[model samples]
Target: SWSWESYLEEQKAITAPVSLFQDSQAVTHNKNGFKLGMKLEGIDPQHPSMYFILTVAEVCGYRLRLHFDGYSECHDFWVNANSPDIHPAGWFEKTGHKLQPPKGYKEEEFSWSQYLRSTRAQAAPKHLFVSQSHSPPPLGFQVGMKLEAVDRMQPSLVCVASVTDVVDSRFLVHFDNWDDTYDYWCDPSSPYIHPVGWCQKQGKPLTPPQDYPDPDNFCWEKYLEETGASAVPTWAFKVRPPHSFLVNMKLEAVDRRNPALIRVASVEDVEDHRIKIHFDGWSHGYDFWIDADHPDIHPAGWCSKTGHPLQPPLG
Candidate 1:
């Protein structure tokens, strides 16, 4: 969950562009070597606290640099990128929003093919492979293809899961009211079969149409039969520690306007609501509580895994 527009297009694509006859009060440097962990947020300009949000980790060529949570090491301050309240420190500098001009740099709005088609709508459609040999179901699956499954008691469970089924792994994911036919295997080796847009740019999920009817209109199956409860489904968890006090151990500083400085790493006990999450700081990986009855946190008839409808927690 980190790409504040590819870190605001790599911090406005190495700023050096702004020049109304040069010197809008300069501090430029963007062609290699500013490097060393490079993540910034500025404006501290000395003990005045007029601008302090820095992160370079070490680049001692203009003075000093090594900030993470900031203000220490004798309040460790000595900046210069031209120091007019430095810059490239991010989260739009706590939302005052002033950092989007590395010189118009446009190709129908910042390219990479327009950030890979705005993340291909949030991705989730992959599965298509029609082979014609090689034994035990070597070829059978086409509705968006991306095979490589295997489940003889989760053989390393390498999950990519999609092909609704050329045989349902042999037969088992039976959608809608369950017809039951269990059998699964495609596991060529498991890194979890990817293919189809492979997470498009990290987005694409319009998904909303798969009907059924009964159990009195199933308002999340009558609130899961009046809360006998369950919502801790997991693939794994535990990696908190950034300010640690143990909200599952503490890695909690996540802000998420695309890593507006963290917030989608994982941590949910849920008592109030707020779990849209979806991170992947290059697989620090995330996609949290999804939408559990999502009415602030699932209660007005709770149900997720995309079954939809939620909001039960606030009492």
Candidate 2:
């Protein structure tokens, strides 16, 4: 879901961009009062395990184009301002979380104060971030927590997942047996992720990444013990993030044909946290199951209301 190359590629089209175009449209700007040029700390989605300092380079709606404080603009990327990944500049010290210098800088060589003074910029105001009382709760997850996560490349599949690294509201998620290139950073409330037994409870088949010891036969209990991990507690996940979709309801949704295009769709099915969406006039082969809380799923007539395009099913 966080692909920078694709973002820049689409940036050329809408004079366009990825689904983020919709996100920028959906949320209000700076509701938290974040300002341009404010300093922040965030996970480098490219090297997510490496926490680094950032700057609010540009603010679009509620989305911020965050520039790695010591890196060139080439590494800058966009995310919602309130994203758990982005925290106020002094957050590392407050949380006692480890911090790192951007590439080429010595790990122990960087200091927030010296850098802030050198750059002559304000650290984002604490009230504008979630790093304090609202900081991601400790112990609700762990580096060794095993769970299920969506394969964004093929969002339909629920794959076996493991946490390789843990940060305050986000975890470095890797699909078991999958290439590290497929790894991503996500939070417990991320609808694409959930407790180990989720697929069975939700009535969908679970798939393993390549090289599983046993292909179709997967067992979390056995796998957990084998990997020296714990099954993430069911309560660790948030309850569907407050969406209002109902089965049979119509909504404007992203059609696979255009990563950024929303189309008229029917909620063919619904689970506690996800729904199967079928494009209007399309057959089941084209249907897909998506998290109810996914940003791309919108209320009926949203395209018209928002003036974003609504594509009809392929003829």
Candidate 3:
């Protein structure tokens, strides 16, 4: 059942390199020495500035699957070997940062030290932690500039796309065929992005945009050279402005993946004029940001006036 040829064929089937990884030419992935049951420290992504204890649940391909201690499988997530978010055991204690407990945690009759004492699991070796490589040189890409991007849903497919927006250190990539549902933010150095002629250079076929002309009719390289379009405009955001929102305040939002599904959401965090919205009953992966005046957000009952079905948040 496990032929080496089949395994290699499946591996080669993956065309899109992992997005979180930097391009291979610039940096080498750190080797992982982590084993099952190792305890470490990581920030609780849902609540910034809070550190929690984590245990290694799985390790695969220079990545570690981490689980929050005392939490169920739903709370587990993966991080690369050299991810900035992961730290060695006792890191918080050494840095004098206080650790927080999982949600709904109550002081057990046993002392915290005793709970830790029960597990003599090995910690991830310090040498396995390496500095993240410096960002790649600027590619000088611009807004409205066409390029080929790896389709997140179909990793082997390279599809046409244009740069819709630019910001400090990142570009907002919008697929030509798909709506904003498949759009994502990535740094120029991400392995998932490539130049317009990348597919040809790699001997792979490119997926033309939905409305694009036939390959014989439209010459992308010549057009890019003739237009001389500059890189997209970039804006810098200062520290977030103050926002008027409180935890547990309910509102409505355009479901990011399914824009047609306007769902009830709760204000999860407030900083400056920006607020983090979490759809009720949805995982933290679906959380997103919106400014105070954005049109997509509405007060609790706006769906009633618009005659759209509103999904109320979980109790």
Candidate 4:
């Protein structure tokens, strides 16, 4: 019942999915046009609504040393030339949002031209920024709405979730029955989000929040009635990442359960762009489904090539 062959032979409807990965492929690069002492406007990663004045303090390869104006050297950090936070000069001004001034300058007194003279800064060329992705879709998720979400570290498990918080288009996907530490932020349209009853409708297994009296036989209808919680609308989920995984391929996947030991695994199932991996030589119950192009799943010889130890399945 676990093998992909079974699903293929039966042509029957099937199971659940996985979460997003952070490590985007690095487009091969060594250097970009940005140079030292250049200026740009950037959004604060921690507080996105606020944009700030920044200087390019140093440049090495395609990475730029981002210096917060008026902040000490310790506050400086590095960013890739194409990082989303970096924007062209006057970018924030056009949005009608005030740029957060540096330590000494007040918004009323600050002037880009006047500040440039004192800072000895040059505006980074407009061409230096890469063409970015399209704007995000509308945000409609509200806090406390219940939904199903793929476990962040172990996408093979679809767990009960709640919209714990929201920052602009991002939602804090908090897994119920799990600690806050396991929570992650995602876009309103991230495929990691699913409507209530999604898992059962797809015949994919569901991991109910822990501490429940009878999770194995838990009824969503009954649970919702008792909890007095509302379900996240299906319309809120507007997208799913595309994938090209076929069943039965051998690959090295991270065993997130223990120590993220990269192990030899066979593709036991792939449903809804999630991969079900069976550790070679291990039991079927150990199998899991993960997101497509997951950073944890690597090509067969990845460990050897990278000098990472590959754990073989235990007998």
For residue 163, give model 3's deviation from the true position in Å.
Answer: 28
lDDT of 1: 0.29
Which candidate, 1 or 4, would have the higher lDDT against the true structure? 4
Q: Report clash pairs, candidate 2.
A: 10-16, 13-16
By TM-score, the best candidate is: 2
TM-score of 3: 0.35
lDDT of 1 by residue, 81-146 (tens): 233233333334343433332223432243323332543321111111112111253233332332
* TM-scores for every predicted model: 0.16, 0.59, 0.35, 0.46
Candidate 3 regions exceeding 4 Å error are 1-29, 102-113, 131-315
lDDT of 2 by residue, 202-249 (tens): 899988757877778878877877777888888888743544455655
The collision pairs in model 3 are 142-232, 241-272, 241-273, 242-272, 243-272
Question: Which tens-of-lDDT digit does each residue in 19-57 have in candidate 3?
Answer: 311232113333467788887777554543456878889
Candidate 4 local lDDT, 1-315, one digit each (tens) = 133334335444222212222333223232478888889887554454456888888765445678888888766766656565677787666545568898898977877888888877788877776422234423668778899998867869998888875543456778887776677666655777789899999899999888888879988888889889899888778775565555766666767565326676777877765678888778888887776645456655555545446786575
The number of residue pairs in model 3 that clash at the backbone is 5
Question: If ranked by lDDT, best first, what sequence of candidates would result?
Answer: 2, 4, 3, 1
Backbone clash count, each prediction separately: 44, 2, 5, 1
